Amino acid sequence: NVSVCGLYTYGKPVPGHVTVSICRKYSDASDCHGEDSQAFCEKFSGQLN
Amino acid sequence: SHGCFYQQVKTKVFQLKRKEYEMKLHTEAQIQEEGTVVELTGRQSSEIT
Ligand SMILES: *[C@@H]1O[C@H](CO)[C@@H](O)[C@H](O)[C@H]1NC(C)=O
């Protein structure tokens, strides 16, 4: 389970088109001209209520 | 009919590093008007030198 919100004063939320992502780095082997351990991840999308 | 199914696949999803050598390619041509599922694990000889 994972969740993301957005407030500022007196907890008044704001509506927006969120674009969250969740990735991992297997072994921080320092790029080798092919991303710094940018290993597979499912990104997501949606609107805030 | 009078042909096949053709396809191009992006190899960057595989990230061919950290010990990667062989890879199998299974199939499943399910013939219509026949409950016949004849597979064929062809070209399990595709390589990365
Ligand atoms: C994760 O969501 C499910 C939804 O049914 C819930 O039962 C479960 O308790 C949630 N996890 C926590 C730590 O509350």
mmCIF file with all atom_site columns, C-alpha atoms and ligand atoms in Angstrom:
data_model
loop_
_atom_site.group_PDB
_atom_site.id
_atom_site.type_symbol
_atom_site.label_atom_id
_atom_site.label_alt_id
_atom_site.label_comp_id
_atom_site.label_asym_id
_atom_site.label_entity_id
_atom_site.label_seq_id
_atom_site.pdbx_PDB_ins_code
_atom_site.Cartn_x
_atom_site.Cartn_y
_atom_site.Cartn_z
_atom_site.occupancy
_atom_site.B_iso_or_equiv
_atom_site.pdbx_formal_charge
_atom_site.auth_seq_id
_atom_site.auth_comp_id
_atom_site.auth_asym_id
_atom_site.auth_atom_id
_atom_site.pdbx_PDB_model_num
ATOM   1   C CA . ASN A 1 1  ? 0.000   0.000   0.000   1.00 0.00 ? 1  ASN A CA 1
ATOM   2   C CA . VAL A 1 2  ? 1.283   3.524   -0.934  1.00 0.00 ? 2  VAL A CA 1
ATOM   3   C CA . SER A 1 3  ? -0.360  7.013   -0.987  1.00 0.00 ? 3  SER A CA 1
ATOM   4   C CA . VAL A 1 4  ? 0.428   10.676  -1.778  1.00 0.00 ? 4  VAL A CA 1
ATOM   5   C CA . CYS A 1 5  ? -1.405  13.933  -0.712  1.00 0.00 ? 5  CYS A CA 1
ATOM   6   C CA . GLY A 1 6  ? -0.944  17.706  -0.951  1.00 0.00 ? 6  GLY A CA 1
ATOM   7   C CA . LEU A 1 7  ? -1.887  20.464  1.557   1.00 0.00 ? 7  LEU A CA 1
ATOM   8   C CA . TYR A 1 8  ? -0.518  23.864  2.774   1.00 0.00 ? 8  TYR A CA 1
ATOM   9   C CA . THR A 1 9  ? -2.613  25.850  5.407   1.00 0.00 ? 9  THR A CA 1
ATOM   10  C CA . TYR A 1 10 ? -5.320  24.597  7.820   1.00 0.00 ? 10 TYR A CA 1
ATOM   11  C CA . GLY A 1 11 ? -5.067  21.278  5.804   1.00 0.00 ? 11 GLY A CA 1
ATOM   12  C CA . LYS A 1 12 ? -6.862  22.710  2.700   1.00 0.00 ? 12 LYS A CA 1
ATOM   13  C CA . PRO A 1 13 ? -5.907  20.225  -0.060  1.00 0.00 ? 13 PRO A CA 1
ATOM   14  C CA . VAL A 1 14 ? -5.278  21.169  -3.679  1.00 0.00 ? 14 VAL A CA 1
ATOM   15  C CA . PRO A 1 15 ? -6.352  19.259  -6.830  1.00 0.00 ? 15 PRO A CA 1
ATOM   16  C CA . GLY A 1 16 ? -3.721  18.081  -9.292  1.00 0.00 ? 16 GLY A CA 1
ATOM   17  C CA . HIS A 1 17 ? -2.667  15.515  -11.899 1.00 0.00 ? 17 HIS A CA 1
ATOM   18  C CA . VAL A 1 18 ? -0.107  13.448  -9.874  1.00 0.00 ? 18 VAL A CA 1
ATOM   19  C CA . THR A 1 19 ? 2.574   11.326  -11.635 1.00 0.00 ? 19 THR A CA 1
ATOM   20  C CA . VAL A 1 20 ? 4.246   9.122   -9.030  1.00 0.00 ? 20 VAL A CA 1
ATOM   21  C CA . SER A 1 21 ? 7.016   6.510   -9.692  1.00 0.00 ? 21 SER A CA 1
ATOM   22  C CA . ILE A 1 22 ? 8.602   3.658   -7.646  1.00 0.00 ? 22 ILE A CA 1
ATOM   23  C CA . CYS A 1 23 ? 12.058  2.370   -8.666  1.00 0.00 ? 23 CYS A CA 1
ATOM   24  C CA . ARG A 1 24 ? 15.113  0.464   -7.316  1.00 0.00 ? 24 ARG A CA 1
ATOM   25  C CA . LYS A 1 25 ? 18.909  0.335   -7.636  1.00 0.00 ? 25 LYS A CA 1
ATOM   26  C CA . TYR A 1 26 ? 20.274  -3.194  -7.476  1.00 0.00 ? 26 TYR A CA 1
ATOM   27  C CA . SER A 1 27 ? 23.981  -2.588  -6.945  1.00 0.00 ? 27 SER A CA 1
ATOM   28  C CA . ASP A 1 28 ? 25.203  1.079   -7.010  1.00 0.00 ? 28 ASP A CA 1
ATOM   29  C CA . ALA A 1 29 ? 27.820  0.208   -9.662  1.00 0.00 ? 29 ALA A CA 1
ATOM   30  C CA . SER A 1 30 ? 28.104  3.922   -10.870 1.00 0.00 ? 30 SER A CA 1
ATOM   31  C CA . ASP A 1 31 ? 26.345  4.155   -14.344 1.00 0.00 ? 31 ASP A CA 1
ATOM   32  C CA . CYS A 1 32 ? 28.825  2.509   -16.905 1.00 0.00 ? 32 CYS A CA 1
ATOM   33  C CA . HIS A 1 33 ? 27.042  4.641   -19.582 1.00 0.00 ? 33 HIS A CA 1
ATOM   34  C CA . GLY A 1 34 ? 23.621  3.055   -19.061 1.00 0.00 ? 34 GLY A CA 1
ATOM   35  C CA . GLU A 1 35 ? 21.900  4.783   -16.046 1.00 0.00 ? 35 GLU A CA 1
ATOM   36  C CA . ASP A 1 36 ? 23.086  4.797   -12.340 1.00 0.00 ? 36 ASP A CA 1
ATOM   37  C CA . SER A 1 37 ? 21.370  1.463   -11.405 1.00 0.00 ? 37 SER A CA 1
ATOM   38  C CA . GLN A 1 38 ? 18.093  2.645   -13.088 1.00 0.00 ? 38 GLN A CA 1
ATOM   39  C CA . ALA A 1 39 ? 16.481  -0.754  -12.740 1.00 0.00 ? 39 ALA A CA 1
ATOM   40  C CA . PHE A 1 40 ? 12.922  -1.616  -13.816 1.00 0.00 ? 40 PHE A CA 1
ATOM   41  C CA . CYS A 1 41 ? 9.914   0.186   -12.293 1.00 0.00 ? 41 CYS A CA 1
ATOM   42  C CA . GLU A 1 42 ? 6.208   0.620   -12.703 1.00 0.00 ? 42 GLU A CA 1
ATOM   43  C CA . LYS A 1 43 ? 5.251   4.301   -12.885 1.00 0.00 ? 43 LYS A CA 1
ATOM   44  C CA . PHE A 1 44 ? 1.632   5.441   -12.266 1.00 0.00 ? 44 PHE A CA 1
ATOM   45  C CA . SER A 1 45 ? -0.808  8.316   -13.024 1.00 0.00 ? 45 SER A CA 1
ATOM   46  C CA . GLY A 1 46 ? -4.093  9.833   -11.798 1.00 0.00 ? 46 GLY A CA 1
ATOM   47  C CA . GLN A 1 47 ? -5.972  12.850  -10.362 1.00 0.00 ? 47 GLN A CA 1
ATOM   48  C CA . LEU A 1 48 ? -6.157  13.918  -6.666  1.00 0.00 ? 48 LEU A CA 1
ATOM   49  C CA . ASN A 1 49 ? -9.579  14.019  -4.987  1.00 0.00 ? 49 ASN A CA 1
ATOM   50  C CA . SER B 2 1  ? -4.355  -15.582 -43.900 1.00 0.00 ? 1  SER B CA 1
ATOM   51  C CA . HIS B 2 2  ? -1.634  -15.737 -46.595 1.00 0.00 ? 2  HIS B CA 1
ATOM   52  C CA . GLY B 2 3  ? 0.847   -14.756 -43.887 1.00 0.00 ? 3  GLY B CA 1
ATOM   53  C CA . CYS B 2 4  ? 1.913   -14.571 -40.235 1.00 0.00 ? 4  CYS B CA 1
ATOM   54  C CA . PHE B 2 5  ? 2.146   -12.149 -37.236 1.00 0.00 ? 5  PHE B CA 1
ATOM   55  C CA . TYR B 2 6  ? 5.245   -9.813  -37.254 1.00 0.00 ? 6  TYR B CA 1
ATOM   56  C CA . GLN B 2 7  ? 6.629   -7.761  -34.281 1.00 0.00 ? 7  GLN B CA 1
ATOM   57  C CA . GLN B 2 8  ? 9.609   -5.469  -33.187 1.00 0.00 ? 8  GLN B CA 1
ATOM   58  C CA . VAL B 2 9  ? 10.510  -5.554  -29.433 1.00 0.00 ? 9  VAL B CA 1
ATOM   59  C CA . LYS B 2 10 ? 12.597  -2.995  -27.492 1.00 0.00 ? 10 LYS B CA 1
ATOM   60  C CA . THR B 2 11 ? 15.608  -4.747  -25.945 1.00 0.00 ? 11 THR B CA 1
ATOM   61  C CA . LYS B 2 12 ? 16.258  -2.012  -23.345 1.00 0.00 ? 12 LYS B CA 1
ATOM   62  C CA . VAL B 2 13 ? 13.586  -3.665  -21.047 1.00 0.00 ? 13 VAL B CA 1
ATOM   63  C CA . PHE B 2 14 ? 16.025  -6.604  -20.703 1.00 0.00 ? 14 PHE B CA 1
ATOM   64  C CA . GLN B 2 15 ? 19.035  -4.519  -19.568 1.00 0.00 ? 15 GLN B CA 1
ATOM   65  C CA . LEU B 2 16 ? 21.392  -7.257  -20.944 1.00 0.00 ? 16 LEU B CA 1
ATOM   66  C CA . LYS B 2 17 ? 24.146  -6.964  -18.263 1.00 0.00 ? 17 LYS B CA 1
ATOM   67  C CA . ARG B 2 18 ? 25.051  -8.489  -14.861 1.00 0.00 ? 18 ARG B CA 1
ATOM   68  C CA . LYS B 2 19 ? 25.434  -11.997 -16.259 1.00 0.00 ? 19 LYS B CA 1
ATOM   69  C CA . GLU B 2 20 ? 22.903  -12.413 -19.209 1.00 0.00 ? 20 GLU B CA 1
ATOM   70  C CA . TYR B 2 21 ? 23.595  -14.989 -21.998 1.00 0.00 ? 21 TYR B CA 1
ATOM   71  C CA . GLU B 2 22 ? 20.665  -17.037 -23.313 1.00 0.00 ? 22 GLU B CA 1
ATOM   72  C CA . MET B 2 23 ? 16.873  -16.583 -23.645 1.00 0.00 ? 23 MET B CA 1
ATOM   73  C CA . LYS B 2 24 ? 14.012  -18.881 -24.758 1.00 0.00 ? 24 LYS B CA 1
ATOM   74  C CA . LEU B 2 25 ? 11.220  -17.811 -27.163 1.00 0.00 ? 25 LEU B CA 1
ATOM   75  C CA . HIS B 2 26 ? 8.039   -19.794 -26.606 1.00 0.00 ? 26 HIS B CA 1
ATOM   76  C CA . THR B 2 27 ? 5.008   -19.640 -28.958 1.00 0.00 ? 27 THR B CA 1
ATOM   77  C CA . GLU B 2 28 ? 1.335   -20.705 -28.837 1.00 0.00 ? 28 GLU B CA 1
ATOM   78  C CA . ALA B 2 29 ? -0.400  -20.755 -32.217 1.00 0.00 ? 29 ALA B CA 1
ATOM   79  C CA . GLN B 2 30 ? -4.001  -21.691 -31.080 1.00 0.00 ? 30 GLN B CA 1
ATOM   80  C CA . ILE B 2 31 ? -5.686  -22.722 -34.343 1.00 0.00 ? 31 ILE B CA 1
ATOM   81  C CA . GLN B 2 32 ? -9.321  -21.533 -34.602 1.00 0.00 ? 32 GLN B CA 1
ATOM   82  C CA . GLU B 2 33 ? -12.163 -24.045 -35.060 1.00 0.00 ? 33 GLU B CA 1
ATOM   83  C CA . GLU B 2 34 ? -9.974  -26.554 -33.225 1.00 0.00 ? 34 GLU B CA 1
ATOM   84  C CA . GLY B 2 35 ? -9.268  -26.694 -29.559 1.00 0.00 ? 35 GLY B CA 1
ATOM   85  C CA . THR B 2 36 ? -5.605  -27.226 -30.595 1.00 0.00 ? 36 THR B CA 1
ATOM   86  C CA . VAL B 2 37 ? -2.808  -25.383 -28.789 1.00 0.00 ? 37 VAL B CA 1
ATOM   87  C CA . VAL B 2 38 ? 0.430   -26.453 -30.562 1.00 0.00 ? 38 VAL B CA 1
ATOM   88  C CA . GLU B 2 39 ? 3.388   -24.508 -29.092 1.00 0.00 ? 39 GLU B CA 1
ATOM   89  C CA . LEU B 2 40 ? 6.995   -24.398 -30.299 1.00 0.00 ? 40 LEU B CA 1
ATOM   90  C CA . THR B 2 41 ? 9.999   -23.248 -28.170 1.00 0.00 ? 41 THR B CA 1
ATOM   91  C CA . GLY B 2 42 ? 11.917  -22.265 -31.295 1.00 0.00 ? 42 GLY B CA 1
ATOM   92  C CA . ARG B 2 43 ? 15.197  -20.345 -31.430 1.00 0.00 ? 43 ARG B CA 1
ATOM   93  C CA . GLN B 2 44 ? 16.297  -20.913 -27.851 1.00 0.00 ? 44 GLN B CA 1
ATOM   94  C CA . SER B 2 45 ? 19.695  -20.251 -29.733 1.00 0.00 ? 45 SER B CA 1
ATOM   95  C CA . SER B 2 46 ? 19.356  -16.338 -29.754 1.00 0.00 ? 46 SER B CA 1
ATOM   96  C CA . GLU B 2 47 ? 22.645  -15.027 -28.158 1.00 0.00 ? 47 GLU B CA 1
ATOM   97  C CA . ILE B 2 48 ? 24.421  -11.961 -26.721 1.00 0.00 ? 48 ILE B CA 1
ATOM   98  C CA . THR B 2 49 ? 28.213  -11.989 -27.407 1.00 0.00 ? 49 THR B CA 1
HETATM 99  C C1 . LIG C 3 .  ? -3.401  -2.251  3.104   1.00 0.00 ? 1  LIG C C1 1
HETATM 100 O O1 . LIG C 3 .  ? -4.700  -2.175  2.485   1.00 0.00 ? 1  LIG C O1 1
HETATM 101 C C2 . LIG C 3 .  ? -5.628  -3.224  2.848   1.00 0.00 ? 1  LIG C C2 1
HETATM 102 C C3 . LIG C 3 .  ? -6.896  -2.986  2.053   1.00 0.00 ? 1  LIG C C3 1
HETATM 103 O O2 . LIG C 3 .  ? -7.865  -4.009  2.269   1.00 0.00 ? 1  LIG C O2 1
HETATM 104 C C4 . LIG C 3 .  ? -5.858  -3.234  4.361   1.00 0.00 ? 1  LIG C C4 1
HETATM 105 O O3 . LIG C 3 .  ? -6.653  -4.356  4.744   1.00 0.00 ? 1  LIG C O3 1
HETATM 106 C C5 . LIG C 3 .  ? -4.524  -3.271  5.098   1.00 0.00 ? 1  LIG C C5 1
HETATM 107 O O4 . LIG C 3 .  ? -4.758  -3.173  6.499   1.00 0.00 ? 1  LIG C O4 1
HETATM 108 C C6 . LIG C 3 .  ? -3.614  -2.135  4.620   1.00 0.00 ? 1  LIG C C6 1
HETATM 109 N N1 . LIG C 3 .  ? -2.377  -2.108  5.391   1.00 0.00 ? 1  LIG C N1 1
HETATM 110 C C7 . LIG C 3 .  ? -2.231  -1.475  6.578   1.00 0.00 ? 1  LIG C C7 1
HETATM 111 C C8 . LIG C 3 .  ? -0.867  -1.550  7.197   1.00 0.00 ? 1  LIG C C8 1
HETATM 112 O O5 . LIG C 3 .  ? -3.160  -0.882  7.126   1.00 0.00 ? 1  LIG C O5 1
#
